[PDB]
Design a protein around this ligand. Sequence first.
Ligand SMILES: OCCCn1nnc2c(Br)c(Br)c(Br)c(Br)c21
Ligand SMILES: NCCc1ccc(Cl)c(Cl)c1
Ligand SMILES: NCCc1ccc(Cl)c(Cl)c1
Ligand SMILES: [Cl-]
Ligand SMILES: [Cl-]
Ligand code: NA
Ligand code: NA
Length: 328
Amino acid sequence: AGSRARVYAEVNSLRSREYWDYEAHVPSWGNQDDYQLVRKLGRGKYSEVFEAINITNNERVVVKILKPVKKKKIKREVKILENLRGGTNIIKLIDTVKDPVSKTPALVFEYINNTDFKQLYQILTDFDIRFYMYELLKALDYCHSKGIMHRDVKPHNVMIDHQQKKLRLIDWGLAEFYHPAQEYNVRVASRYFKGPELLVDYQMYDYSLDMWSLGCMLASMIFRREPFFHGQDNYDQLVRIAKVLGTEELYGYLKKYHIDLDPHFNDILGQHSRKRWENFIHSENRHLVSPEALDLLDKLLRYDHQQRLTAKEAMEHPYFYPVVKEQS
Ligand SMILES: OCCCn1nnc2c(Br)c(Br)c(Br)c(Br)c21
Ligand SMILES: NCCc1ccc(Cl)c(Cl)c1
Ligand SMILES: NCCc1ccc(Cl)c(Cl)c1
Ligand SMILES: [Cl-]
Ligand SMILES: [Cl-]
Ligand code: NA
Ligand code: NA
């Protein structure tokens, strides 16, 4: 009874228990021998990712081989991906497979030809940013409507094929089901994309965490400061936020939710006014900034997770009118 989501709060309760009870999920594990690994694409604490070919039909795919130890987390990611099947701009899980001898599991995803935006021919326009942000919001509205928080929204988890104009939200390994009043682990998201709720150890968070991360991406793309809030560690991350949003405003948020603040913060927060968003504009980013971009940003990068726009409200904002008009 501390906080709950403004949208989609009871949606899992209204579904069959099997929908959200991922520990009870029994995946159907197909045969990894149908896939030929071509090249390594990346590696994380829990997985490694390869480009591959399905030798039975010549399809190019991505294979994520899972370090098999933590079976509950595997079931969680599999069930979430199955629940999100067909969702707009969510990476498509094609199959769940195992090495038939070792039984190590892997996930097979659709291929996306991921653009490196550091190495571009013409770099992003105002319309490009509006377009891709709208496409990303479609994925977040979809997963939130499906009762799921992504909890790791960041540029590297948003694949964009800038030639075909295709966007996919990937890496659902940290995603969870939202249940009202549930207390969640705050050790989620990338440092630069962690919401203030995580940084102050507030466990009763919801889908609005992803909307903070989204806002951080919007700020970095319109202002060209990437990442926008560049903490040196989790403590400094909150200081970077407070230098923009203000310290008195932080304390008002903490008071509202009765949040205890780790006293190490007292020695590092200092005192900071809330800054005007227009302060971030200069000649190198002016062409990407508009009154409507700043109004949207202001409504996403708020301490109070409850008062941030939902993904749908964000999609409805005038910033996206040119996108909706072109899409019609
Ligand atoms: O869902 C976790 C996925 C991990 N992961 N890491 N790098 C990826 C790239 Br490049 C592409 Br293309 C795709 Br498709 C996926 Br899938 C990738
Ligand atoms: N968290 C997954 C990050 C990741 C790893 C590899 C690739 Cl190729 C991409 Cl796009 C993104
Ligand atoms: N890896 C692509 C990250 C990215 C870049 C630009 C935009 Cl506008 C978005 Cl939504 C996402
Ligand atoms: Cl959790
Ligand atoms: Cl700053
Ligand atoms: Na898809
Ligand atoms: Na802390």
